[PDB]
Design a protein around this ligand. Structure first.
Ligand code: SF4
Ligand code: SF4
Ligand code: FCO
Ligand SMILES: [Cl-]
Ligand SMILES: [Fe+2]
Ligand code: NI
Ligand SMILES: [S]
Lengths: 283, 483
């Protein structure tokens, strides 16, 4: 990219998120986050990093949205809570009127080129939707479907996702759009999503079947303490067998470690995370 | 000469999480304030019924900026509840994991959250548009230094997360801290890798970050004269320096009404009159805490509970810890206080109460604390023993309780767990931004930031920049505050 090149507008809305999906993106190595922001996208609204504030920030987003109706990308971080008329997530106020996450997704969702549901919360409900919750935390695709909103959704899950999954999915979509236009390009992206809406370049391979400890698993050689790095981690709770992600190869944080080497995989990219992956520390 | 204007800011940006601030301005100054945390998830109810060991993963998702703090408080609570005796080398390894995120978090806060309060960024989103009269006072050269350092800091904070991940597995959301210690013994090779990254971070902190905070501060000397609030602080202790549980890098204490006092955790109570929780749950200590949402309750304005310490409204964070502990100032700080401010100082309290408890004083304290943490990490790198075991594997108890106390980058954090029938019966969290960004208590006394907003200047109601500047000095994360 260049400072002077074409960069599509992006709005980043946080619902019931922890900001971990923003922080993981800040950790991108190649390209760096500076290059992403200055050369790849135009991040027009993002409450954690943007210059302006309050109603002015909301109105700026609305002005860009009108100019780029049908053409902006909408990133959602966190789940969307529907209970109590949306009151468990208020994202802004304008004109003396509060804006819930429910309101915001109904407003901007219909007019986005595509919605990128970043993180397991947005993709599948995640921890805010888990047993013991009471906010009506809802995944993006289900919320949009329930409200008749047909805009395409791409899920980029993980808790958090790896930065390469987020940036790489953006790069994949922008490439498809460059070659085919918006509708043709999004059709090419949909073709490479699995049944859970995830791009197969990043989520098309199972961790366990590619794990360096697979021989130990097949031999029944299991570590009894976390600090034994020779044995397989299955008895300690590893969920690699049920998890579709490429962590075994790209690893984390500049390649310095990953969950299976350090401890166990907790299946964080899967639609049943956390309840279907718990307890974390037994099989 | 002017009357009232009431100003609402939602979202407050360049913080973590969902915050609305509403201030009453009369005659050019804030005279009242209300802070509203507008998003709730309910971790304290989600946790119930689970295997207690799961908590040290679940709790980190309270907040992806400070997950190591929640991990630490959780494993300390579980250690106590399980009777787990963490090996000495695991104690040190935990400190290396967590300490690296203090560096990440303070650098993120000053550059990527706060610096745009004083620095104009490049002419493209997300750096524009902004207030037409943003009160950006820096020369062309110093503004450019701020931008150049913002950009460099993006790399430095990423390197800090590589440091976290070396023994923590990944970041955000470490895998490497569990009940009983740390899951990966440091090897000689990975300790080399941690030290090489740490040197780059140290050089940035010493040469760029600490100097730029004092230098920008010297162009905003008026910002040391506002934001005092109650001038009352809390520290609960953090970073155990031996296995006794009695010695910590930051020692506990309370400061209020000009007096140092001991910290007794039994004096914490959480009030809810102005919070969206059932009225019957008001006034509980965390060991008996309850979390019953009431989003329609009349008069309430926040999902943050109102914690009070023996009735006092206190603040937490770097200022609190540095004031309570009064360490020596960094060599850089001493020199620049003299050269740019005409101040002769040796220890942190030599700034004086008024300047320390101020908008810019909180930025200074955070920079000084970052430098202070460098020395702690260097010490742990000398103390750690490559190859020595870092974990024990304790059985889950049927019935137990435990409390973990630490200091997150933004201030005091505790987690309390009660186990019954080998499952979580109650789990209560009292976090840093809870102490700072809470609403009024049942007696009408304001939270720390609400009170620190009193007196903030708003000489231009169309460009009321100092309201959110004050808020950002406290480095709020509303995910932590509400959970
Ligand atoms: S259970 Fe986990 S550690 Fe064992 S082979 Fe499978 S993915 Fe690897
Ligand atoms: S190894 Fe498992 S828990 Fe770790 S990031 Fe990959 S999918 Fe998530
Ligand atoms: N730092 C941090 Fe998070 C907050 N506030 C906690 O505790
Ligand atoms: Cl932290
Ligand atoms: Fe709490
Ligand atoms: Ni936090
Ligand atoms: S945080």
């Amino acid at each position: 990219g260049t400072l002077t090149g074409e960069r599509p507008p992006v709005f980043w809305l946080q619902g019931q998120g922890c900001t971990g999906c923003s922080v993981t993106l800040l950790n991108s190595v190649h390209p760096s986050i500076a290059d992403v922001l200055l050369k790849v996208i135009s991040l027009e609204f993002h409450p954690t990093v943007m210059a302006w504030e309050g109603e002015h920030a909301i109105e700026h987003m609305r002005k860009v949205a009108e100019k780029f109706k049908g053409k902006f990308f909408l990133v959602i971080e966190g789940s969307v809570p529907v209970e109590a008329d949306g009151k468990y997530c208020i994202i802004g106020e304008a004109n003396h009127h509060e804006i819930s996450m429910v309101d915001a997704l109904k407003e901007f969702g219909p007019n986005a080129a595509a919605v990128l549901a970043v993180g397991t919360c947005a993709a599948y409900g995640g921890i805010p939707a888990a047993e013991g919750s009471e906010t009506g935390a809802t995944a993006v695709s289900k919320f949009l479907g329930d409200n008749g909103i047909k805009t395409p959704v791409v899920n980029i899950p993980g808790c958090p996702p790896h930065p390469d999954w987020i940036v790489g999915t953006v790069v994949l979509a922008l490439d498809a759009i460059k070659k085919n236009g918006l509708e043709g390009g999004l059709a090419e992206v949909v073709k490479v999503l699995d049944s859970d809406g995830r791009p197969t370049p990043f989520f098309g391979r199972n961790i366990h079947e590619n794990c360096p400890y697979l021989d130990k698993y097949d031999e029944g050689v299991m570590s009894a303490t976390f600090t034994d790095k020779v044995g397989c981690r299955y008895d300690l709770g590893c969920k690699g067998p049920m998890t579709m992600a490429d962590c075994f190869e790209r690893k984390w944080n500049g390649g310095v470690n990953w969950c299976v080497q350090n401890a166990v995989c907790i299946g964080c990219v899967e639609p049943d995370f956390p309840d279907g992956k718990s307890p974390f520390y037994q099989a | 000469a002017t009357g009232r204007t009431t100003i609402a800011i939602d979202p407050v940006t360049r913080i973590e999480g969902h915050l609305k601030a509403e201030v009453v301005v009369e005659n050019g100054k804030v005279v009242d304030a209300r802070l509203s945390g507008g998003m709730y998830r309910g971790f304290e109810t989600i946790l119930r019924g689970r295997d207690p060991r799961d908590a040290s993963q679940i709790v980190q998702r309270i907040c992806g900026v400070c997950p190591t703090a929640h991990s630490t408080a959780s494993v300390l609570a579980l250690d106590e509840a399980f009777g787990a005796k963490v090996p000495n080398n695991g104690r040190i390894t935990r400190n290396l994991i967590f300490g690296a995120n203090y560096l990440q978090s303070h650098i993120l806060h000053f550059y990527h959250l706060s610096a745009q309060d004083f620095v104009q960024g490049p002419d493209t989103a997300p750096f524009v548009p902004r207030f037409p009269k943003s009160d950006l006072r820096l020369s062309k050269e110093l503004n450019k230094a701020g931008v150049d350092q913002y950009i460099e800091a993006l790399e430095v904070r990423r390197i800090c997360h590589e440091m976290v991940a070396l023994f923590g597995g990944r970041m955000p959301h470490v895998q490497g801290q569990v009940v009983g210690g740390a899951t990966e013994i440091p090897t000689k090779e990975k300790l080399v890798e941690y030290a090489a990254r740490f040197k780059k971070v140290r050089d940035f902190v010493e040469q760029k970050y600490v100097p730029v905070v004092y230098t920008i501060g010297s162009k905003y000397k008026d910002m040391f004269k506002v934001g005092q609030g109650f001038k009352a602080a809390l520290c609960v202790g953090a970073f155990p320096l031996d296995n006794s549980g009695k010695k910590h890098l930051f020692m506990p204490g309370v400061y209020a009404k000009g007096k140092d006092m001991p910290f007794d955790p039994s004096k914490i109570k959480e009030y809810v009159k102005y919070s969206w929780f059932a009225e019957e749950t008001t006034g509980l200590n965390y060991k008996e805490g309850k979390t019953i949402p009431a989003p329609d309750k009349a008069g309430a304005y926040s999902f943050v509970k109102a914690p009070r310490y023996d009735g006092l409204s206190l603040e937490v964070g770097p200022l609190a810890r540095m004031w309570v502990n009064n360490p020596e100032l960094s060599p850089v700080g001493k020199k620049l206080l003299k050269d740019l401010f005409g101040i002769s100082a040796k220890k942190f309290r030599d700034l004086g109460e008024e300047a320390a408890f101020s908008l810019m004083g909180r930025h200074v304290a955070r920079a000084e604390e970052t430098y202070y943490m460098l020395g702690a990490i260097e010490g742990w790198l000398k103390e750690i023993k490559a190859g020595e075991d870092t974990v024990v594997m304790p059985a889950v108890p049927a019935s137990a309780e435990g409390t973990g106390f630490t200091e997150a980058p933004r201030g005091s954090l505790l987690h309390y767990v009660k186990v019954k029938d080998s499952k979580i019966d109650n789990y209560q969290i009292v976090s840093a931004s809870l102490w700072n960004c809470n609403p009024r208590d049942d007696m009408g006394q304001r939270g720390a930031v609400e009170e620190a907003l009193i007196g903030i200047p708003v000489d231009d109601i169309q460009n009321p920049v100092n309201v959110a500047r004050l808020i950002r000095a406290f480095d709020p994360x509303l995910g932590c505050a509400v959970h």
